[PDB]
Amino acid sequence: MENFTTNLNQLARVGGIDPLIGREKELERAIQVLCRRRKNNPLLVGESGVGKTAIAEGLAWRIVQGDVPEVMADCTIYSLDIGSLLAGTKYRGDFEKRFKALLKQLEQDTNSILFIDEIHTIIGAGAASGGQVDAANLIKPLLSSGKIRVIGSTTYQEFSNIFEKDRALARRFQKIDITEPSIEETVQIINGLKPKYEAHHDVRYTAKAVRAAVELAVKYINDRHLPDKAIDVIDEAGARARLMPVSKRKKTVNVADIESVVARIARIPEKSVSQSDRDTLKNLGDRLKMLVFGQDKAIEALTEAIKMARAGLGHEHKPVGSFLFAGPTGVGKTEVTVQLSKALGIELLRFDMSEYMERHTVSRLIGAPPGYVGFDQGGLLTDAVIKHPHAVLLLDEIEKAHPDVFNILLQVMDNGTLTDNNGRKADFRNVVLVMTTNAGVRETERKSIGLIHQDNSTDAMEEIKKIFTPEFRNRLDNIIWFDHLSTDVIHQVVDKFIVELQVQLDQKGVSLEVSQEARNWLAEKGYDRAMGARPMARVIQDNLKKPLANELLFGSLVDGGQVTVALDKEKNELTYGF
Amino acid sequence: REKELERAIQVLCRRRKNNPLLVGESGVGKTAIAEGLAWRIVQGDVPEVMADCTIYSLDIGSLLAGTKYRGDFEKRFKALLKQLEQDTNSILFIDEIHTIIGAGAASGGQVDAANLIKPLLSSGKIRVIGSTTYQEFSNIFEKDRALARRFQKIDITEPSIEETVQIINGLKPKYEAHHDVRYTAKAVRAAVELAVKYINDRHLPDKAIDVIDEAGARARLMPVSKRKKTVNVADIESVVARIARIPEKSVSQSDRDTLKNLGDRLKMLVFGQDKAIEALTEAIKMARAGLGHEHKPVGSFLFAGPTGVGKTEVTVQLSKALGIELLRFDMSEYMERHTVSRLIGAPPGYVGFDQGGLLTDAVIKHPHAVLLLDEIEKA
Numbered sequence: 001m002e003n004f005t006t007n008l009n010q011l012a013r014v015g016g017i018d019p020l021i022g023r024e025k026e027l028e029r030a031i032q033v034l035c036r037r038r039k040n041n042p043l044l045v046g047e048s049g050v051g052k053t054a055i056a057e058g059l060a061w062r063i064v065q066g067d068v069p070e071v072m073a074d075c076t077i078y079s080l081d082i083g084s085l086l087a088g089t090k091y092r093g094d095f096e097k098r099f100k101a102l103l104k105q106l107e108q109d110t111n112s113i114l115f116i117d118e119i120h121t122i123i124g125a126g127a128a129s130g131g132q133v134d135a136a137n138l139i140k141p142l143l144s145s146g147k148i149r150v151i152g153s154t155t156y157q158e159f160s161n162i163f164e165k166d167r168a169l170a171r172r173f174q175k176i177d178i179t180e181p182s183i184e185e186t187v188q189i190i191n192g193l194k195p196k197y198e199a200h201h202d203v204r205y206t207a208k209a210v211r212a213a214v215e216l217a218v219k220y221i222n223d224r225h226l227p228d229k230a231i232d233v234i235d236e237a238g239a240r241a242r243l244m245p246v247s248k249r250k251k252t253v254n255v256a257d258i259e260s261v262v263a264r265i266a267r268i269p270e271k272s273v274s275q276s277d278r279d280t281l282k283n284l285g286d287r288l289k290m291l292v293f294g295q296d297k298a299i300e301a302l303t304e305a306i307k308m309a310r311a312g313l314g315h316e317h318k319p320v321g322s323f324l325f326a327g328p329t330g331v332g333k334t335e336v337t338v339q340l341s342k343a344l345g346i347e348l349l350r351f352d353m354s355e356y357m358e359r360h361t362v363s364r365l366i367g368a369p370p371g372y373v374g375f376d377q378g379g380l381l382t383d384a385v386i387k388h389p390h391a392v393l394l395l396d397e398i399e400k401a402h403p404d405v406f407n408i409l410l411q412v413m414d415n416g417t418l419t420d421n422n423g424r425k426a427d428f429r430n431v432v433l434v435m436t437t438n439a440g441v442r443e444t445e446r447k448s449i450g451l452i453h454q455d456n457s458t459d460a461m462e463e464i465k466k467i468f469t470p471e472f473r474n475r476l477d478n479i480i481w482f483d484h485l486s487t488d489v490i491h492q493v494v495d496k497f498i499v500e501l502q503v504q505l506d507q508k509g510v511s512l513e514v515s516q517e518a519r520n521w522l523a524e525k526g527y528d529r530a531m532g533a534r535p536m537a538r539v540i541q542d543n544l545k546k547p548l549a550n551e552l553l554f555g556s557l558v559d560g561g562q563v564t565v566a567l568d569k570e571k572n573e574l575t576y577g578f
Numbered sequence: 579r580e581k582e583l584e585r586a587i588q589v590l591c592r593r594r595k596n597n598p599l600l601v602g603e604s605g606v607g608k609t610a611i612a613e614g615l616a617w618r619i620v621q622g623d624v625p626e627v628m629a630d631c632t633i634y635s636l637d638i639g640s641l642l643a644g645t646k647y648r649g650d651f652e653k654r655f656k657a658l659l660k661q662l663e664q665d666t667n668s669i670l671f672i673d674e675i676h677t678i679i680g681a682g683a684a685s686g687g688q689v690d691a692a693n694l695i696k697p698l699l700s701s702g703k704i705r706v707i708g709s710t711t712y713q714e715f716s717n718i719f720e721k722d723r724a725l726a727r728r729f730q731k732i733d734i735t736e737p738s739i740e741e742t743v744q745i746i747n748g749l750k751p752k753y754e755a756h757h758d759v760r761y762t763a764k765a766v767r768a769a770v771e772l773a774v775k776y777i778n779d780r781h782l783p784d785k786a787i788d789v790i791d792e793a794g795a796r797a798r799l800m801p802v803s804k805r806k807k808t809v810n811v812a813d814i815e816s817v818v819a820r821i822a823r824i825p826e827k828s829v830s831q832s833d834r835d836t837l838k839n840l841g842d843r844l845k846m847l848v849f850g851q852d853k854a855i856e857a858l859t860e861a862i863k864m865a866r867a868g869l870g871h872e873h874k875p876v877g878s879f880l881f882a883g884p885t886g887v888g889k890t891e892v893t894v895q896l897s898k899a900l901g902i903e904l905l906r907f908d909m910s911e912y913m914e915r916h917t918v919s920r921l922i923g924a925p926p927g928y929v930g931f932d933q934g935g936l937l938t939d940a941v942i943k944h945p946h947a948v949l950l951l952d953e954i955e956k957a
C-alpha cells in the first residue's frame with residue numbers, strides 16, 4: 001500500500017490538508033458511524049461545492065489533531081483514488097497483487113480506515129483496469145468483519161444509483177447528508193484558500209473582496225454550493241486583475257473587482273450586479289399604455305406588481321410574478337404580454353396551450369420517460385427556462401390545457417422551480433409568468449326585454465372561479481381583468497392600424513395620407529364592443545387595403561408615390577391618383 | 579418464526595415445486611431464517627427427510643473474484659452446481675436470489691448462471707432455497723416459469739415487540755462485548771419500543787439493533803462507557819433521536835398534559851373561538867382515553883364557519899401541537915366523479931400506477947396525520 005494508498009493523516013500532519021472549517025456535526029456522524037459494529041462505514045453524500053471530500057480530509061485532520069476520542073484519534077485514514085491501483089493495466093499480475101497487498105496490510109492494521117473518493121468508480125461500476133468489481137467485493141468482507149473501515153464520497157443522485165442498488169453496502173455503510181456551509185464559513189474557507197489564489201495569480205485579496213465574493217456569488221450565481229461559487233469569483237477576480245490591466249498591473253483585488261467578475265460568471269450585466277434598471281421599470285406603464293389602449297387599469301396592475309417584485313417585496317424563491325389575464329376577445333390580453341416582453345427587453349417564451357390538450361403534454365413539457373424517444377428533451381418548458389432563466393413566459397389560452405399541466409404550474413408558483421426528467425432544474429425566479437384565459441369572454445349577445453334597455457351583464461370572473469380551482473387561483477399574484485373597449489379606444493386603435501398600414505406601404509414606396517374624417521368614419525363603421533379591436537383590423541382592411549391592393553397591383557400605385565384618402569360628405573372613401 | 583423454518587422444510591420435503599423461497603422486505607428477517615435453517619442442520623434439529631444435508635450459500639463474489647471472465651465464472655459455477663448436485667440431500671441456498679438473475683456477481687461472469695440452475699431445479703438434483711423480496715418476487719420468479727414453478731412462495735413478515743427484545747438480548751452480549759457497554763432491561767425494551775414509534779420506514783429487527791449498536795458504539799466513542807458502561811433508556815432516547823430527532827425531546831412528555839395544554843396552546847395562535855378549540859381538545863382527550871374502537875378514526879369533526887376565521891389555522895395548530903402531519907384536500911376539486919376515483923385510488927381512475935389513491939397514499943405515509951377536507955359541501 002506504500003505507493004498505492006494516500007495517507008491522509010500524514011497529509012494532515014504535513015499540512016497537505018487544510019483545517020476543516022465548521023462541520024462539527026458531519027464529522028461527529030462520521031465517527032459515530034466508524035465506531036459501530038454494523039453499518040459502520042460512513043458515506044459523505046452531497047452535491048457540488050459542499051466539500052464532502054474536504055470533510056473526509058477534515059476528519060483525517062481531526063484524527064491527527066486529536067479532536068476526536070481515541071476510538072478514532074490516531075487511527076489512520078488513507079485515501080484511494082483512481083491513479084495508483086488503476087495503473088495495473090497489465091491486469092491482475094500487477095493489480096490483484098497490489099490491490100490485495102492493501103487489503104492484507106489494512107486487514108492487519110484494523111485501526112486503518114480507507115477513504116474512497118468518487119466511490120461510484122467501484123460501486124455500481126468496477127471496471128477501470130478491469131480489476132475493480134471484485135476489488136470492491138474483496139473489500140466488502142473486511143468491512144463486514146470490522147477489519148477495514150471505509151469512508152465513502154458520493155452525491156445524492158449517484159448514491160441512489162450506486163448504494164441503493166447494492167445490499168452489501170446497505171448493511172455496511174451509512175449515509176451522512178452533506179450540505180453547503182454558512183456564509184461566514186465560506187468566507188473563512190476562502191481565506192484559507194485565498195493565498196493559493198494570490199500565489200497563482202500574483203494578486204492580493206482584501207477582506208472586503210473575500211466577504212463580497214461570497215455574498216455576491218450568492219446573489220447572482222446559482223450553479224453550485226457556496227464554496228465553489230465563491231471560489232470561482234475569487235479565482236476569476238484574481239485572474240482578471242492580472243490579465244486586463246497590462247498597463248496598470250494592480251495586484252490587490254477589492255469588492256469592485258468581485259463585482260465585475262461576478263457579473264460575468266453569473267451571466268448578468270457588469271452594471272446590474274450592483275445597479276438595476278430603475279428607469280425601464282418606472283417607464284413601463286407608459287410604454288405599454290401607448291401600445292394597448294384603454295386597458296389602463298390592467299396595465300397598471302401588471303406594472304405595479306412587477307415593480308413590487310423588482311423592488312424586492314416578495315419571496316426570493318418565487319417567479320417574478322404570476323398573472324392570469326382575462327376578458328372579452330379583441331381586448332389586448334395577449335398583445336400586452338407580447339409588448340410587455342418587448343418593453344422589458346426580455347425574450348418571450350411562448351407556449352400555446354391548445355397544443356397541450358392531451359394527457360401526454362407532460363412528455364413534451366417535462367420530457368418523455370427514460371427508454372422513450374423524447375427522454376432526451378429536458379422538457380420544452382423546463383429547457384426553455386433553463387436556457388433563458390430571465391424571460392417572459394406566456395401560456396396562451398390556459399383553460400385549454402389538459403388539467404395535468406396544473407400540477408406543473410402549481411409547483412412552479414410555490415417553489416420557483418421545476419425539475420426535468422434528468423434531474424436538472426429550471427429557475428423561474430427571473431421569469432414573468434403570464435397566462436391568459438378566455439373563460440372570461442363568455443357573455444351574451446341578447447338584450448333585456450322591454451322598451452328601455454338595461455345592462456344585463458353577468459358577474460366578472462365567476463366563469464374563472466368555475467374553471468380554475470382555488471389552489472391555482474390562490475397562487476397567482478393577480479387576475480387582471482381586461483374590459484371591453486370603448487369608441488375612444490377605437491379611435492386610438494385606428495390610428496395604430498393606419499400607421500401599420502403605412503409601414504407596409506412604405507415598403508412599396510407608397511405614402512398614404514388618411515384624412516382625419518376618413519379615420520373618424522372608419523372608427524365608427526367598424527365598432528363592435530363584443531369583438532373588441534379585431535373588427536377594426538377588419539374595417540381598415542376592407543376600406544383601405546382593398547383599394548390600395550388593387551392599385552398596387554394593377555393601377556396607379558405600382559411605381560411608388562403619393563396616395564391620399566378623403567372622406568366624402570356621403571361617407572365614402574375617396575382616393576387620390578399619384 | 580418457527581413456522582417459517584418449518585414451512586421451508588415442508589417445501590424441501592416436496593418432489594416438485596419443492597424449492598422454498600423466502601420472500602421478504604428489508605428488515606423482516608428472511609436472511610435470518612435461511613441462517614436458521616443451516617443452524618438447525620448443524621445442531622441436528624432437522625427431520626430425516628433432510629438427513630445430514632448441507633446447506634451452502636452461493637458465493638457469487640468468490641465465483642467472480644480473481645478472474646471476471648465468463649469462462650472462469652462458468653467453470654467454477656458449473657463445477658459448483660455439479661458438486662452440489664452430487665451431494666446427497668444437498669441444498670443450495672441462494673441469498674440475494676434476485677441479484678444473480680443478471681450474471682452472477684457481475685457482467686463478464688456467468689450470464690447464464692440462472693440458466694444453469696433452471697435444469698437442476700427441473701430435475702430436482704439440488705434442493706434450492708431462495709431469498710428474495712416481495713417486490714422482486716414478481717420480477718424474478720413470475721418472470722420465468724422455470725423458477726415460478728420450481729419455487730414456493732413463503733411470506734416472511736417482521737417479528738413482534740417481544741421477539742425483537744429477545745433478538746436484542748440474544749445479540750446484546752455481542753454489542754456489550756463490542757463496545758465495552760452493558761444494556762439495561764429498559765434499554766433493550768426501549769430500543770424496540772421506541773424504534774417502532776420514531777423510525778417509521780423500517781422494520782424493527784434492524785432498527786432496534788442499530789439503536790443498541792449505536793448506543794454502545796456512541797458510549798465507547800464518547801467518554802461514557804469508560805465509566806458509564808450501562809446504556810439505559812436515556813441513552814436509547816439520544817440514539818434513536820440521533821437520526822429521528824424525536825425521542826430526545828419527545829419520547830415521552832405527557833400523554834395527558836400535551837392534550838390538556840392543547841386548549842391553551844391553540845388560544846395563543848388562533849384568537850377567538852375559544853369554545854371551538856376547547857371542543858376539539860375534549861374530543862381528542864376522549865379518544866386518547868380509549869373511548870372508541872380499534873378500527874375507528876381518532877375522531878371526526880365538521881368545522882362550520884365564515885372563511886378567513888382560522889378554521890385551517892386551528893387544524894394546522896392541532897397538527898403541530900399533537901406532533902402529527904397535516905394532509906389536505908380541497909373538495910371542490912373532487913366535485914366530478916372521475917376525480918373522485920383519483921382521490922380514492924379506486925381500481926379504475928387512480929393516479930399513476932403506484933400513486934393510486936391520493937388519500938390512500940396520504941393515509942399510508944402519514945397514518946397518524948390530521949386530514950383536512952375543505953368545503954365538503956362541494957364534494
Ligand SMILES: Nc1ncnc2c1ncn2[C@@H]1O[C@H](COP(=O)(O)OP(=O)(O)OP(=O)(O)O)[C@@H](O)[C@H]1O
Pocket residue numbers: 291292293294295328329330331332333334335336438441485493532533534537
Ligand atoms: N387594447 C388594444 N389596443 C390596441 N390594439 C389592440 C388591443 N387589443 C388588441 N389589439 C390588436 O388586435 C389584435 C389581437 O389582439 P390580441 O391577440 O392580444 O387578443 P387577445 O387578448 O389574445 O384575445 P383572444 O385570445 O381571446 O383572441 C392584435 O394585433 C392587437 O394588435
Ligand SMILES: Nc1ncnc2c1ncn2[C@@H]1O[C@H](COP(=O)(O)OP(=O)(O)O)[C@@H](O)[C@H]1O
Pocket residue numbers: 018019020021022023046047048049050051052053054055058181189192193227228231
Ligand atoms: N469545512 C471546510 N473547510 C474548508 N474548506 C471547505 C470546507 N467545506 C468545503 N470547503 C471547500 O469546498 C471545496 C471542496 O469541495 P468539492 O471538492 O468542490 O465538492 P465536490 O467534489 O462535490 O464538487 C474546496 O474548495 C474546500 O475548500
Ligand SMILES: Nc1ncnc2c1ncn2[C@@H]1O[C@H](COP(=O)(O)OP(=O)(O)O)[C@@H](O)[C@H]1O
Pocket residue numbers: 579602603604605606607608609610611737745782783784785787
Ligand atoms: N427474525 C430475526 N431474528 C433476529 N434478528 C433478525 C431477524 N430478522 C432480521 N434480523 C436482523 O435485523 C437486520 C436486518 O435483517 P436482514 O436479514 O438483513 O433483512 P433485509 O436485508 O431484507 O433488510 C439484520 O441485522 C438481521 O440480523
Ligand SMILES: Nc1ncnc2c1ncn2[C@@H]1O[C@H](COP(=O)(O)OP(=O)(O)O)[C@@H](O)[C@H]1O
Pocket residue numbers: 847848849885886887888889890891
Ligand atoms: N382564527 C385565526 N387566527 C389567526 N389568523 C387567522 C385566523 N383566521 C384567519 N386568519 C388569517 O386570515 C388569512 C387566511 O386564513 P387561512 O385559514 O390560512 O385561509 P382560509 O381563508 O381558507 O381560512 C390568513 O392570513 C390567516 O392568518
